[PDB]
Amino acid sequence: LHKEPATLIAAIDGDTVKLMYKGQPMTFRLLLVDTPEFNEKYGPEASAFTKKMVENAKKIEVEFDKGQRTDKYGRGLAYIYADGKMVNEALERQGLAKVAYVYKGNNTHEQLERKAEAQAKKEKLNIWS
């Protein structure tokens, strides 16, 4: 896989963000994770965590997997990096998302995510508390 440039347009919630990619505004949905909706327990914390991570970054990058790049809603499907740190993995490591929506051929980083989730679960963090 490879990283491509993007710039933040607006944080949306724990697992979605508006980026400009190849000069076009797009909503991106993070691969392999499920954050609680804003109305749900840990939803506000998930949204705040992802907001702070993308707003604080000097450099946002997008990394598509090998399969589908857009979902049925037109959202891009990617791993998102803030100054080289993967947002998808960080949400797992903090107990603010569950590994979810793992479709064959778009799951390059599954085991990295599950590892992070196991560590969060060990620590009883957030969703696992």
What residues act catalytically? 29, 37, 75
**Smallest distance, ligand THP to C-beta of residue 58, A:** 27
> Does 65 show up as a binding residue in the annotation?
no
The DSSP line for 57-81 is -S-EEEE--SS-SB-TTS-EEEEEE
Residue 71, contacted partner among ligand THP, Ca ion, none, CB below 5-8 A by kind: ligand THP
Using rule CB under 6 A, residue 93 touches ligand THP: no
- Residue partners of 82: CB distance under 8 A and separation at least 6: 53, 54, 56, 57, 59, 60
Using CA atoms, how far residue 96 sits from 16, 26, 36, in Å, is 14, 24, 8
> Does 34 show up as a binding residue in the annotation?
yes
Residues in contact with ligand THP, counted by CB under 6 A, come to a total of 8
Q: Which has the closest alpha carbon to 77: 98, 105, 51?
A: 105
- Binding to ligand THP, residues 20-59 (CB under 6 A): 29, 31, 34
Closer by beta carbon to ligand THP, 58 or else 72: 72
Residue 77, contacted partner among ligand THP, Ca ion, none, CB below 5-8 A by kind: ligand THP
Backbone angles phi, psi at 77, to 5 degrees: -125, 110
Closer by beta carbon to ligand THP, 59 or else 66: 66
- Binding residue positions: 15, 34-35
